């Protein structure tokens, strides 16, 4: 019963490298394969380059990597021929040839000064590339004022720039944009506000005691006002603060709360009473809304003024919220379900040191991570019976009335034959770091007349949308469990899935396919390494003009770009800047895996990780024509 | 120099106002150990005294990208100056700069010496010989302020510079920040014209032109530029496209090629047809992207069972059918983009219809009818079976035409042939079905002209269908062959409705009697997407010409980059013409931008009287209907005054006012910029207060203080008033004529006690001495703000910076209070000399100023030196002349 | 004459080593035309501490301008060895 199966990514890409998995189980000896890609519909011959042969040495496992050189999506007809037995199918293509990136040397510009942006080309993988590009510059009204068209070839991915802001030009929020010429529909947006300003010499932090406001906390949301000069020392002055009621995008200014206190020593104290709160507007209604502050510090010398502002403080009686979005939405009947609740303080930030327990099993407990996600589990009975989960937060100091709760649901995993053949992958979910060894647990589930036939599992590793690595693992008859030692490199960062499965023919002439996916977030780090420090081994504050050697440590052969910035520009405006953390935060939003947690059936687990399965006896995965993942249905 | 301090002569000034610097690019050249490279750079820290924050990005070809997020190098010193200059200040207006002297000494308060230097761009309390310096005492770990008044007399990037040095301690640091002194003005962008372009619809001629007037800007402040921008916007529309059929309940079309030639085609005819369609409609997704390869094998599947009856040219037993061989070229010349077809089994059954089944007139005969006789469709009507049979084989060989234009000699003659018999007999047709079958047998050649064109447009009953009495599957096939032309023709005002009838029949195909009813209700609906204009248009190509263009101007708004805004601009004022051309619609908008009560809703009135301790009084009213919210009262004293520590707490206790407990500290010595927070400024009336100020510091020439009124929500709508005990409102006493300003803060410049030959040679060879002339006053004008004297130089004793020949007239200027200085009468000679700092205006149009250093002496006439009383002066002046022209100064 | 006393041997060698670097303050103040806006603010201000202090014959202002003026020559011989 030689049968020929085959896999790939769920949504392909362009001018990029996607892999794919040949196979020949129960095959005899050799088998010359020839792979190909024809545009759809018809025949144009786009990439037929690949060839391979499945030794009985690579366990009947062959492997190949390629480079694929309206308003409706276009597709790619892909073909594989195993000696004579040919199998083919179609997969959705995405116009995106990678990502594009911006950094404005200043966050706010005086009309007349120059702007120094710089952009960085890369692919679906984080390496340098040389293509071609378009770069405009729009005013706050939406009109391209100047554009360019250079290419990052033999430039090493990095690009130089300079545009002068005319004396007369509109003030507000300008917007610079870019996009690969190959793909004119995928464009990127970065901004710099033009305004007539003078740099302040200090900074102002607005810090309420509470993250959020309890509705029945008479005392009210208090707030500490701490002013400090740019260079560290403590600012002396008097300030002006004002509060308000936001309701989505609308802001209810409260002129009955406008205070003034003595910023002494770079620390002043302002409170707002719960009565100046009720008469700016019942109170089971203001729940859901958030508030916002507006400080304004003017020194006792009358030279400078700074304007600080906090926004999005929630009036939640139930401090912690309970998210089920790192959580799988399916299970496997008769085996453990790992629970990755996502607790948040009211603003959006994750909770800490807050026990949570199952609805039943009062004994069961979890402990908070520095991240707002703990570790829980429970045995599932051998039922295809949907699992109704009512998590309850159990942190003391509060009541079973102030404790927020959230109910999600996990669904069965449908096995072909349904004869009763499951696979369950158990993993030491740890805050994995580059250089660690992570175990991989295989819990088979079958009667003992067809377990003398499963001699190898097969698997894969997702990563930002591409396929990272593959091969096989060995299982001997009588071992319903084999561990798989895997070492972590810098690449799986940020998050990476993993899919596994076997093939056998059992029951009554029925080749069977059972599988199981899985998703883990590995520590978010720039993959190589880089730091900037002060060269001198002894640091004393250099006076204006002096020489200080500046040491630096990075990867060899790497190019490096550098720029300094006065901390007096980030006291009128410190947004639109660049965070590596805003870097990965975007390379995840562009994943093809969507329900990392689980799978409905052996095919669902594939589209629910970013993969299309197909074979030579009928079984195959869902045809994904949906670029943007399943628009989250709350 | 020898004081316990640092003169202004070494205090290098902190001019690093700018935020961006050190934007360098450096690679990892050094050899690396363990994949880690070390670079050392020696940077020169900018002058700004704050805390520079870093930020860098590493791109390694191996190690993708990293963020070596920046740390922090704090830059501080023991004593510096935070020169706080605005982004700009208007010319001719008096303002108030702030300059904070931060002393972060442990517990050593600094005895400072802060001195504003002169700048001939700023009429301040510091002139060319006078210094405006003071002596303050900043307590330890504190911020102390110091007000400085000025009047920017010149536009353009000007210069301000404060340097301070402590007594007894040897610290020193200035800050040279520069401010953009702009001419007063209002940011405006008048619209020049807002019109539409389209040489198709507008002008009614090609090359539609559009003349354009220059911007009037009647009210443009002099010496200021102004730009104009232009916009190029394509505004295309899309319409007249209808939806193909959902193919959704059309899941019976792919039944497998099986049987004898004729049964091998009743059931493969719906096959290929579903394929050609869902190809050019993009329905493949919701149907099954996958059943397509369960169908491209039931097309080439019959291709080798159908290649199993092709006698030498149905049954192979039976005589070849002229109907199954001219439909063997209709199911093949379309399944050529789908499967492997032989240009020998296609180009070897079309040289058989021209050479075997063609009469001398191009009419086609039927020898052996086809055994299945319902599949022939609508020819089955023996009615005109050489007008529905001469029009059917006529479309099976105009279809195979490009494939093999070289494999058949016999084509070029058979094509015109058939078509000459038909066009003649085209006026001789009844059946709406033979009018549409010949109709499209013809319209692929360009001959349906005249009478054959209008008889084919009326045959459509209701004009959307070509129908005959009786069978319906011969009306759909008539409506199809009818739309076939409609589009082969490039007309689409009669296609819209014809396509709303065919999918109103929800004809999902198949059936018995429908092997032609299926092949046409689709290929027609299948070809309607490749023609669809989609209303895509716009080949605009406009030409620009402008009084600045030495070069030609050209862009083009093609459909692919049509919404790409193609804009152009300049800095100069012109007239010009535009010249549009080509299809497509767009819109044109153009806009120039140029330069067209300080109180804005805040009254202020600041008063100063004696009680040498004085008493101040301020008046503020809000020009609102609502009593304005929390407002503020900024106050910087005059040099030598601290508030009476007993009236800063009589207004701090009263409600509606406040004095942060931070203003009771420091006491009487350190308090020269106050902050009295107000809780409301009524709109009804002025709300007035007042306190006391003693005289603790004694000094000459005190400083016009101030009082600033603004709400907290807008630092912008404020009203600042000044107050001096001497001039009326705080404004120093100056002489203005028009645009020009000067510092008349001086005394009445003016008994011949002594004047000898030596007394002159010394004062005429001094440093400032620049010009020396013997002029004769010609004209004497006098204004209400100052006088002037147009004197002509009769000789240049000493040429200065001003290049002036003997005879020309140089204008002299003097205050109106100097009319008693020297009554410069007309037609009298005078010996004069001054400094170069007295020049006024700009070469060659300069103007002299009779200042304190301008020597004015009366020169006796020719017949006046005869007087025995003017001789002593005539000899001195005469000798002084020769002692200068040839000799010179003794230094 | 025999031999100096207590405040007679340390206040004078502190005015010898503040006059050995005041003799060539006309030699190091001129080579900061080839260096930054740093070596021209730090050797022009740190020069008025080595002339008023050598002239007040005080033991404190002389050991406060012989190092202030001996840190900015080791800074000027240093930025003169990347310039050869
Ligand atoms: C045969 C083998 O061991 N390695 C292959 C090799 O093509 C590569 O590691 C990968 C492509 O990503 O596919 C697998
Ligand atoms: C009437 C008119 O055209 N005025 C507009 C004004 O609304 C806009 O705020 C300004 C921005 O600079 O440009 C101009
Ligand atoms: C993911 C993986 O294991 N890839 C490897 C790669 O190191 C190498 O390019 C190749 C050499 O044949 O073997 C494969």
Describe the structure.
- Chain A: This is Complement C3 beta chain.
- Chain A: Disulfide bonds join 594-629.
- By secondary structure, chain A is an all-beta fold.
- Chain A has 3 helices and 49 strands.
- The relative contact order of chain A is 0.12.
- Chain B folds into 6 domains: 2-77, S-adenosyl-L-methionine-dependent methyltransferases (Single Sheet), CATH 2.20.130; 78-185, Immunoglobulin-like (Sandwich); 186-247 and 535-597, Jelly Rolls, CATH 2.60.120; 248-534, Glycosyltransferase (Alpha/alpha barrel), CATH 1.50.10; 598-730, Immunoglobulin-like, CATH 2.60.40.690; 731-891, OB fold (Dihydrolipoamide Acetyltransferase, E2P) (Beta Barrel).
- Chain B contains 11 helices and 46 strands.
- Chain B is elongated and about 150 Å long.
- Chain C has 84 residues and is largely without helices or strands.
- In chain C, 0% of the residues lie in helices and 0% in strands.
- The termini of chain C are far apart.
- The interface between B and C is medium-sized, with 17 and 17 residues.
- Strand 46 (547-550) of chain A pairs antiparallel with strand 3 (41-44) of chain B, so a sheet runs across the interface.
Counting structural domains of chain B, the number is 6
CATH class descriptor name of the largest domain in chain B: Mainly Alpha
Secondary-structure class of chain C: little secondary structure
Helix fraction of chain C, binned, reads under 10%
Structural class of chain B: alpha+beta
Distance between the termini of chain C: 50 Å
Cα radius of gyration of chain C in angstroms? 15 Å
- The total count of helices of chain B amounts to 11
Number of strands of chain B: 46
Total beta-strand segments of chain C: 0
| Major sheet strand order of chain B | 45-43-42-41-44-46
Keywords (chain C): Secreted, Signal, Virulence
Region (Essential for activity) (chain C): 30-47
Main location (chain C): secreted
GO cellular component, one term (chain C): extracellular region
């Amino acid at each position: 019963s030689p049968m020929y199966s085959i896999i790939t990514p769920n949504i392909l890409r362009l001018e990029s490298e996607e892999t794919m998995v040949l196979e020949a189980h129960d095959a005899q000896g050799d088998v010359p394969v020839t792979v190909t890609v024809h545009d759809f519909p018809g025949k144009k011959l786009v990439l037929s380059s690949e060839k391979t042969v499945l030794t009985p040495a690579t366990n009947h496992m062959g492997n190949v990597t390629f480079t694929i050189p309206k308003g409706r999506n276009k597709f790619v007809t892909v073909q594989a021929t195993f000696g004579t037995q040919v199998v083919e199918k179609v997969v959705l293509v995405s116009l995106q040839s990678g990502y594009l990136f911006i950094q404005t040397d200043k966050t706010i510009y005086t009309p007349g000064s120059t702007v120094l942006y710089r952009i960085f080309t890369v692919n679906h993988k984080l390496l340098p590339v040389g293509r071609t590009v378009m770069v405009n510059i729009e005013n706050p009204e939406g009109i391209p004022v100047k554009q360019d068209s250079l290419s990052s070839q033999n430039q090493l991915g990095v690009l130089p720039l300079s545009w002068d802001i005319p004396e007369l030009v509109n003030m507000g929020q300008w917007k610079i944009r870019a996009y690969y010429e190959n793909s004119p529909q995928q464009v990127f947006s970065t901004e710099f506000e033009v305004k007539e300003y003078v740099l302040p010499s200090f900074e102002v932090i607005v810090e309420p005691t509470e993250k959020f406001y309890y509705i029945y906390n008479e005392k009210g949301l208090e707030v500490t006002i701490t002013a400090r000069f740019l260079y560290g020392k403590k600012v002396e002055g008097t300030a002006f603060v004002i509060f308000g009621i936001q309701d989505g995008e609308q802001r209810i200014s409260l002129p009955e709360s406008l205070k003034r206190i003595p910023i002494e020593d770079g620390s002043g104290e302002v409170v707002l009473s719960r009565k100046v709160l009720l008469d700016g507007v019942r109170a089971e209604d203001l729940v859901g809304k958030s508030l916002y502050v507006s400080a304004t510090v003017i020194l006792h010398s009358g030279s400078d003024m700074v304007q600080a502002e906090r926004s999005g403080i929630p009036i939640v009686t139930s401090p912690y919220q309970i998210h089920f979005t790192k959580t799988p939405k399916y299970f496997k009947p008769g085996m453990p379900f790992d629970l990755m609740v996502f607790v948040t303080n009211p603003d959006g930030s994750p909770a800490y040191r807050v026990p949570v327990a199952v609805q039943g099993e009062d004994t069961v407990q979890s402990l908070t991570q520095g991240d707002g996600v703990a570790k829980l589990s429970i045995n599932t009975h051998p039922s295809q019976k949907p699992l109704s989960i009512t998590v309850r937060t159990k942190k003391q100091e509060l009541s079973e009335a102030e404790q927020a709760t959230r109910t999600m649901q996990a669904l069965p995993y449908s096995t072909v034959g349904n004869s009763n053949n499951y696979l369950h992958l158990s993993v030491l979910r740890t805050e994995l770091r580059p250089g660690e060894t992570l175990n991989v647990n295989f819990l088979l589930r079958m009667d003992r007349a067809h377990e003398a036939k499963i001699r190898y599992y097969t698997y894969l590793i997702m990563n930002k949308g591409r396929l990272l690595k593959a091969g096989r693992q060995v299982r001997e008859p009588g071992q319903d469990l084999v561990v798989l030692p895997l070492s972590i490199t810098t690449d799986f960062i940020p998050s990476f899935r993993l899919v596994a499965y076997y093939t056998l023919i059992g029951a009554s002439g029925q080749r069977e396919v059972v599988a199981d996916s899985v998703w883990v977030d590995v520590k978010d780090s720039c993959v190589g390494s880089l730091v900037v420090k002060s060269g001198q081994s002894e640091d004393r504050q250099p006076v204006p003009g002096q020489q200080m050697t500046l040491k630096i440590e990075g990867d060899h052969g790497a190019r490096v770009v550098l720029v300094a910035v006065d901390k007096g520009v980030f006291v009128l405006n410190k947004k639109n800047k660049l965070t590596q953390s805003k870097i990965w935060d975007v390379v995840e939003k562009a994943d093809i895996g969507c329900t990392p947690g689980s799978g409905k059936d052996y095919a669902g687990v594939f589209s629910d990780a970013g993969l299309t399965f197909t074979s030579s006896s009928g079984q195959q995965t869902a045809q994904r024509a949906e670029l943007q993942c399943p628009q989250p249905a709350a | 120099l020898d004081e316990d301090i640092i003169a202004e002569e070494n205090i290098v000034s902190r001019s690093e106002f700018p935020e961006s610097w050190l934007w360098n690019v450096e690679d990892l050249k050094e050899p690396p150990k363990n994949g880690i490279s070390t670079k050392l750079m020696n940077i020169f820290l900018k002058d700004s005294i704050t805390t520079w924050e870093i930020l860098a990005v590493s791109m390694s070809d191996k190690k993708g990208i990293c963020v070596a997020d920046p740390f922090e190098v704090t830059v501080m010193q023991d004593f510096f100056i935070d020169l706080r200059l605005p982004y700009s200040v208007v010319r001719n207006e008096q303002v108030e700069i702030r300059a904070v002297l931060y002393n972060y000494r442990q517990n050593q308060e600094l005895k400072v010496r802060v001195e504003l230097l002169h700048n001939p761009a700023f009429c301040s309390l510091a002139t060319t010989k006078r210094r405006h310096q003071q002596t303050v005492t900043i307590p330890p770990k504190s911020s102390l302020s110091v007000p400085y008044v000025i009047v920017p007399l010149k536009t353009g990037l000007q210069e301000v510079e404060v340097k301070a040095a402590v007594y007894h301690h040897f610290i020193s640091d200035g800050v040279r920040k520069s401010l953009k002194v702009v001419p007063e003005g209002i940011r405006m962008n008048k619209t020049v014209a807002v019109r539409t372009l389209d040489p198709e619809r507008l002008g009614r001629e090609g090359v539609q032109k559009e003349d354009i007037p220059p911007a009037d800007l009647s009210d443009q402040v002099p010496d200021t530029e102004s730009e104009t921008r232009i916009l190029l916007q394509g505004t295309p529309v899309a319409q007249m496209t209808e939806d193909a059929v959902d193919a959704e309940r059309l899941k019976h079309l792919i039944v497998t090629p099986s049987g004898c030639g004729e049964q091998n085609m009743i059931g493969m005819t719906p096959t290929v047809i579903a394929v050609h369609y869902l190809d050019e409609t993009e329905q493949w997704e919701k149907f099954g992207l996958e059943k397509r390869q369960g169908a491209l094998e039931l097309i080439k599947k019959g291709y080798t069972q159908q290649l199993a009856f092709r006698q030498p040219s149905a049954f192979v037993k039976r005589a070849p059918s002229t109907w199954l061989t001219a439909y063997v070229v209709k199911v093949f010349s379309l399944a050529v983009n789908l499967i492997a077809i032989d240009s020998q089994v296609l180009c070897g059954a079309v040289k058989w219809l021209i050479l075997e089944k063609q009469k001398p007139d191009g009419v086609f005969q039927e020898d052996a009818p086809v055994i299945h006789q319902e599949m022939i469709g609508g020819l089955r009507n023996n009615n005109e079976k050489d007008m529905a049979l001469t029009a059917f084989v006529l479309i099976s060989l105009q279809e195979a035409k490009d494939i093999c234009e070289e494999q058949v000699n016999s084509l070029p003659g058979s094509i015109t042939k058939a078509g000459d018999f038909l066009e003649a007999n085209y006026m001789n047709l009844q059946r709406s079905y033979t009018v549409a079958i010949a109709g499209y047998a013809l319209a692929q050649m360009g001959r349906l002209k005249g009478p054959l064109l209008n008889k084919f447009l009326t045959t459509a009953k209701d004009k959307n269908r070509w129908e005959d009495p009786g069978k319906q599957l011969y009306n759909v096939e008539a409506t199809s062959y009818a739309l076939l032309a409609l589009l082969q023709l490039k007309d689409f005002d009669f296609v819209p409705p014809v396509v709303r009838w065919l999918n109103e029949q929800r004809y999902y195909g198949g059936g018995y009697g429908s092997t032609q009813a299926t092949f046409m209700v689709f290929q027609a609906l299948a070809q309607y997407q490749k023609d669809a204009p989609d209303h895509q248009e716009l080949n605009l190509d406009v030409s620009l010409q402008l009084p600045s263009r030495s070069s030609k101007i050209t862009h083009r708004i093609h459909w692919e980059s049509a919404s790409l805004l193609r804009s152009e601009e300049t800095k100069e004022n012109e007239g010009f013409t535009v010249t549009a051309e080509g299809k497509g619609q767009g819109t044109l908008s153009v806009v120039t931008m140029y330069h067209a009560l300080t109180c804005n809703k805040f009254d202020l009135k600041v008063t100063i009287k004696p009680a040498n301790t004085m008493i101040l009084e301020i008046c503020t009213r809000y020009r609102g209907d609502q009593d304005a919210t929390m407002s503020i009262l900024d106050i910087s004293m005059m040099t030598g005054f601290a508030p009476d520590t007993d009236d800063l707490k009589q207004l701090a206790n009263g409600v509606d006012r406040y004095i942060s407990k931070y203003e009771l500290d420091k006491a009487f010595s350190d308090r020269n910029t106050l902050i009295i927070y107000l809780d409301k400024v009524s709109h009804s009336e002025d709300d007035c207060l007042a306190f006391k100020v003693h005289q603790y510091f004694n000094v000459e020439l005190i400083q016009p203080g101030a009082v600033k009124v603004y709400a907290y929500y807008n630092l912008e709508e404020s009203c600042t008033r000044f107050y001096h005990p001497e001039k009326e409102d705080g404004k120093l006493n100056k002489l203005c004529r028009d645009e020009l300003c000067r510092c008349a803060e001086e005394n009445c410049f003016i008994s011949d006690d002594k004047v000898t030959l030596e007394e002159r040679l010394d004062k005429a060879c001094e440093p400032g001495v620049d010009y020396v002339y013997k002029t004769r006053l010609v004209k004497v004008q006098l204004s209400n703000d100052f006088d002037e004297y147009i004197m002509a130089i009769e000789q240049t004793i000493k040429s200065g910076s001003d290049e002036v020949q003997v005879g020309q007239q140089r204008t002299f200027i003097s205050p109106i209070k100097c009319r008693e200085a020297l009554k410069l009468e007309e037609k009298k000679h005078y010996l004069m000399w001054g400094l170069s700092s007295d020049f006024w205006g700009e070469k060659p149009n300069l103007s002299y100023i009779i200042g304190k250093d301008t020597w004015v002496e009366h020169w006796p006439e020719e017949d006046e030196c005869q007087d025995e009383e003017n001789q002593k002066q005539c000899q001195d002046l005469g000798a002084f002349t020769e002692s200068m022209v040839v000799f010179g100064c003794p230094n | 004459t025999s031999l100096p006393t207590s405040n007679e041997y340390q206040n004078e060698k502190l005015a010898n080593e503040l006059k050995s670097l005041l003799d060539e303050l006309n030699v190091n103040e001129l080579a900061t035309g080839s260096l930054n806006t740093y070596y021209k603010r730090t050797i022009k201000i740190s020069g008025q501490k080595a002339m008023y202090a050598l002239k007040s014959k005080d033991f404190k202002k002389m050991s406060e301008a012989k190092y202030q003026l001996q840190k900015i020559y080791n800074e000027i011989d240093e930025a003169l060895k990347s310039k050869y």
